[PDB]
Amino acid sequence: DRARTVQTALDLLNESGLDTLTMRRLAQAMDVQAGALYRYFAAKQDLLTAMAEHMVDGVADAAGATGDGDWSERTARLARALRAALLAHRDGARVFAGTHATGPNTLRFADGLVGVLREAGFGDGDAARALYSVANFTVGHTLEEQAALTPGGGGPLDEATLREAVAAGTYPHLAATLPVLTSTDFTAHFEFGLRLLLDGLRAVR
Amino acid sequence: DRARTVQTALDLLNESGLDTLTMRRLAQAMDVQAGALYRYFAAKQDLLTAMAEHMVDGVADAAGATGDGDWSERTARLARALRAALLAHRDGARVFAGTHATGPNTLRFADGLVGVLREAGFGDGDAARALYSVANFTVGHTLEEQAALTPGGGGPLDEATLREAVAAGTYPHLAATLPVLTSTDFTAHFEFGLRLLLDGLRAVR
């Protein structure tokens, strides 16, 4: 019932986006009274929190076992799986980024990531700080990727938006690099940023 | 008039946050009819876009001139100044992250950052991709920092939230690193992630 409500809400999210997702809209979708939904979720933020926790089901398992790649490969698989889980839902990064509890799925992901680094010889401080760096980069990247793919675009560095504002005469470095900036290859951008973080971790180990 | 409206909106933002900022609330604040505001801003997203562009005024100047530190120091100053500009306003990262145009202030920041890297010997692709990595990490980090400082907390890896869910018996790597995870030293976390990115750039140069 809670589970079915979460699934319906995720369906609605894909259909018309986060901004249109209301408890009333969800009630209309399930042919119940909004009153009913409020018995399962005290507030919309509780529903959103449950959605975010469901979206990341299985993310922690992306690391596999020790030996399934070196620490940098396993760390990369965790970050990629988090990105993929958020991209699987329209406005998914916004839902995850705005969540008001940390559930078991997220805790397993965080513990797993910190564990991979500690077991590979990173000290406590480096491993915990790396969790925040990797997670915050992944969320920031995915938020901006999803903003760009939203009908009409969005985000401060939206590919298409950059192109029209730019000239070599006024923003020459943006003009010179326009093919890359306006690339729809978000995956390549993500991999590059992840590579920077992992190279940086190699340097600090 | 547009400028005064933007300032009033930023004032309101600090007072009660992004979720309560409405065109009607802004109209009440300026003792005008909402109709009036819609003559200056066709939609609330246009106001938000103008707010975001104003928040980052002067960010691009953080890089200073060539020689004012090496490329890594100038790149770090740009990222720090962006973070600081968003932290200066309640929910500032949310406003910036959700913007629907790329104005001159943001373009100058982006062009300046890419320019610092190109002039230091990075190829076009690396410099442009680095812009996205640094900006997306900075935005993701600041979004999550602001979520945590919001009355009641928030964000998937909120310091306080982590503490209560964790035991050494169930999330041992989180338990072991709890001092760091629950640290209110967001600045230290930011500097660490920035260091990772810059070390990674040193590696790829």
Side-chain angles (χ1 to χ4, degrees), chain B residues 153-173:
Chain B
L157 302 176
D158 184 317
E159 13 121 347
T161 312
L162 256 162
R163 160 150 306 112
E164 334 158 87
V166 161
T170 47
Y171 305 99
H173 297 295

mmCIF file of all heavy atoms in Angstrom, chain B residues 153-173:
data_model
loop_
_atom_site.group_PDB
_atom_site.id
_atom_site.type_symbol
_atom_site.label_atom_id
_atom_site.label_comp_id
_atom_site.label_asym_id
_atom_site.label_seq_id
_atom_site.Cartn_x
_atom_site.Cartn_y
_atom_site.Cartn_z
ATOM 1 N N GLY B 153 17.131 20.170 8.930
ATOM 2 C CA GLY B 153 18.100 19.383 8.168
ATOM 3 C C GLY B 153 17.535 18.951 6.821
ATOM 4 O O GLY B 153 16.493 19.463 6.378
ATOM 5 N N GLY B 154 18.220 18.019 6.166
ATOM 6 C CA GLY B 154 17.806 17.541 4.852
ATOM 7 C C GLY B 154 19.018 17.135 4.045
ATOM 8 O O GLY B 154 20.158 17.401 4.452
ATOM 9 N N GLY B 155 18.783 16.485 2.906
ATOM 10 C CA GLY B 155 19.868 15.979 2.078
ATOM 11 C C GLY B 155 20.121 14.540 2.475
ATOM 12 O O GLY B 155 19.944 14.188 3.644
ATOM 13 N N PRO B 156 20.530 13.691 1.508
ATOM 14 C CA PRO B 156 20.666 12.253 1.807
ATOM 15 C C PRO B 156 21.778 11.909 2.804
ATOM 16 O O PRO B 156 21.709 10.848 3.441
ATOM 17 C CB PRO B 156 20.975 11.633 0.440
ATOM 18 C CG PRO B 156 21.610 12.769 -0.349
ATOM 19 C CD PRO B 156 20.876 14.003 0.101
ATOM 20 N N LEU B 157 22.793 12.772 2.922
ATOM 21 C CA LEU B 157 23.954 12.477 3.778
ATOM 22 C C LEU B 157 24.113 13.546 4.860
ATOM 23 O O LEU B 157 25.233 13.890 5.257
ATOM 24 C CB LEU B 157 25.235 12.328 2.938
ATOM 25 C CG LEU B 157 25.216 11.255 1.843
ATOM 26 C CD1 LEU B 157 26.498 11.290 1.025
ATOM 27 C CD2 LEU B 157 25.006 9.883 2.465
ATOM 28 N N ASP B 158 22.976 14.064 5.324
ATOM 29 C CA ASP B 158 22.955 15.076 6.365
ATOM 30 C C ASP B 158 23.697 14.516 7.583
ATOM 31 O O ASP B 158 23.377 13.427 8.084
ATOM 32 C CB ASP B 158 21.510 15.444 6.704
ATOM 33 C CG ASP B 158 21.399 16.586 7.720
ATOM 34 O OD1 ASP B 158 22.147 16.611 8.717
ATOM 35 O OD2 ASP B 158 20.524 17.446 7.543
ATOM 36 N N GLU B 159 24.721 15.262 7.997
ATOM 37 C CA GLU B 159 25.510 15.004 9.208
ATOM 38 C C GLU B 159 24.726 14.435 10.399
ATOM 39 O O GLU B 159 25.002 13.312 10.835
ATOM 40 C CB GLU B 159 26.271 16.273 9.632
ATOM 41 C CG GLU B 159 25.817 17.562 8.938
ATOM 42 C CD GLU B 159 25.336 18.619 9.913
ATOM 43 O OE1 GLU B 159 25.120 18.293 11.110
ATOM 44 O OE2 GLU B 159 25.154 19.776 9.475
ATOM 45 N N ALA B 160 23.752 15.183 10.910
ATOM 46 C CA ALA B 160 22.992 14.752 12.098
ATOM 47 C C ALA B 160 22.202 13.457 11.845
ATOM 48 O O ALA B 160 22.187 12.546 12.679
ATOM 49 C CB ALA B 160 22.076 15.853 12.568
ATOM 50 N N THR B 161 21.561 13.394 10.683
ATOM 51 C CA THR B 161 20.758 12.244 10.270
ATOM 52 C C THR B 161 21.589 10.935 10.264
ATOM 53 O O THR B 161 21.158 9.915 10.824
ATOM 54 C CB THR B 161 20.089 12.523 8.898
ATOM 55 O OG1 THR B 161 19.468 13.815 8.936
ATOM 56 C CG2 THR B 161 19.019 11.476 8.575
ATOM 57 N N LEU B 162 22.778 10.994 9.652
ATOM 58 C CA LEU B 162 23.757 9.899 9.689
ATOM 59 C C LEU B 162 24.013 9.341 11.088
ATOM 60 O O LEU B 162 23.833 8.145 11.322
ATOM 61 C CB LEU B 162 25.066 10.311 9.012
ATOM 62 C CG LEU B 162 25.088 9.634 7.651
ATOM 63 C CD1 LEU B 162 26.072 10.254 6.658
ATOM 64 C CD2 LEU B 162 25.415 8.180 7.882
ATOM 65 N N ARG B 163 24.385 10.218 12.022
ATOM 66 C CA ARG B 163 24.653 9.823 13.413
ATOM 67 C C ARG B 163 23.629 8.869 14.033
ATOM 68 O O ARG B 163 24.003 7.869 14.642
ATOM 69 C CB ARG B 163 24.821 11.054 14.318
ATOM 70 C CG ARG B 163 24.621 10.752 15.818
ATOM 71 C CD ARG B 163 25.444 11.660 16.734
ATOM 72 N NE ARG B 163 26.867 11.628 16.390
ATOM 73 C CZ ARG B 163 27.541 12.654 15.874
ATOM 74 N NH1 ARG B 163 26.938 13.824 15.653
ATOM 75 N NH2 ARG B 163 28.830 12.506 15.588
ATOM 76 N N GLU B 164 22.348 9.172 13.882
ATOM 77 C CA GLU B 164 21.300 8.417 14.597
ATOM 78 C C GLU B 164 20.993 7.088 13.930
ATOM 79 O O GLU B 164 20.669 6.116 14.596
ATOM 80 C CB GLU B 164 20.015 9.239 14.699
ATOM 81 C CG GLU B 164 20.259 10.730 14.652
ATOM 82 C CD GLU B 164 19.036 11.496 14.219
ATOM 83 O OE1 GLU B 164 18.220 11.824 15.107
ATOM 84 O OE2 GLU B 164 18.887 11.750 12.994
ATOM 85 N N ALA B 165 21.099 7.048 12.601
ATOM 86 C CA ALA B 165 20.823 5.807 11.867
ATOM 87 C C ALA B 165 21.961 4.781 12.015
ATOM 88 O O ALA B 165 21.757 3.583 11.870
ATOM 89 C CB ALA B 165 20.561 6.116 10.424
ATOM 90 N N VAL B 166 23.150 5.272 12.343
ATOM 91 C CA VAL B 166 24.354 4.454 12.328
ATOM 92 C C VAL B 166 24.612 3.717 13.651
ATOM 93 O O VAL B 166 24.300 4.207 14.735
ATOM 94 C CB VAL B 166 25.560 5.306 11.848
ATOM 95 C CG1 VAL B 166 26.875 4.718 12.227
ATOM 96 C CG2 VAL B 166 25.489 5.483 10.344
ATOM 97 N N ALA B 167 25.116 2.499 13.514
ATOM 98 C CA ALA B 167 25.770 1.734 14.567
ATOM 99 C C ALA B 167 27.000 1.069 13.916
ATOM 100 O O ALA B 167 27.022 0.864 12.685
ATOM 101 C CB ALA B 167 24.817 0.659 15.133
ATOM 102 N N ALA B 168 28.011 0.742 14.742
ATOM 103 C CA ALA B 168 29.207 0.017 14.259
ATOM 104 C C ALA B 168 28.785 -1.389 13.843
ATOM 105 O O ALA B 168 29.400 -1.998 12.970
ATOM 106 C CB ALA B 168 30.296 -0.022 15.334
ATOM 107 N N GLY B 169 27.703 -1.883 14.460
ATOM 108 C CA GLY B 169 27.182 -3.222 14.172
ATOM 109 C C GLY B 169 26.465 -3.348 12.826
ATOM 110 O O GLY B 169 26.244 -4.493 12.353
ATOM 111 N N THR B 170 26.041 -2.217 12.236
ATOM 112 C CA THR B 170 25.296 -2.276 10.970
ATOM 113 C C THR B 170 25.918 -1.493 9.831
ATOM 114 O O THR B 170 25.868 -1.965 8.701
ATOM 115 C CB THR B 170 23.834 -1.845 11.083
ATOM 116 O OG1 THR B 170 23.777 -0.616 11.818
ATOM 117 C CG2 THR B 170 23.042 -2.914 11.808
ATOM 118 N N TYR B 171 26.475 -0.311 10.118
ATOM 119 C CA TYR B 171 27.218 0.488 9.110
ATOM 120 C C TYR B 171 28.581 0.854 9.678
ATOM 121 O O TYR B 171 28.811 2.003 10.073
ATOM 122 C CB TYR B 171 26.438 1.761 8.672
ATOM 123 C CG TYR B 171 25.050 1.408 8.179
ATOM 124 C CD1 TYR B 171 23.940 1.539 9.018
ATOM 125 C CD2 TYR B 171 24.863 0.884 6.899
ATOM 126 C CE1 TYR B 171 22.626 1.169 8.571
ATOM 127 C CE2 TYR B 171 23.585 0.512 6.435
ATOM 128 C CZ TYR B 171 22.474 0.665 7.268
ATOM 129 O OH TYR B 171 21.230 0.280 6.788
ATOM 130 N N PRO B 172 29.481 -0.134 9.746
ATOM 131 C CA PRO B 172 30.740 0.053 10.485
ATOM 132 C C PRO B 172 31.660 1.110 9.910
ATOM 133 O O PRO B 172 32.365 1.755 10.669
ATOM 134 C CB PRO B 172 31.408 -1.347 10.428
ATOM 135 C CG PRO B 172 30.754 -2.063 9.262
ATOM 136 C CD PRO B 172 29.365 -1.489 9.149
ATOM 137 N N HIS B 173 31.670 1.295 8.590
ATOM 138 C CA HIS B 173 32.538 2.304 8.014
ATOM 139 C C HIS B 173 32.018 3.694 8.286
ATOM 140 O O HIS B 173 32.802 4.606 8.563
ATOM 141 C CB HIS B 173 32.691 2.041 6.518
ATOM 142 C CG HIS B 173 33.354 0.736 6.247
ATOM 143 N ND1 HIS B 173 34.657 0.494 6.621
ATOM 144 C CD2 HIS B 173 32.878 -0.426 5.740
ATOM 145 C CE1 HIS B 173 34.986 -0.738 6.290
ATOM 146 N NE2 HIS B 173 33.921 -1.321 5.762
#
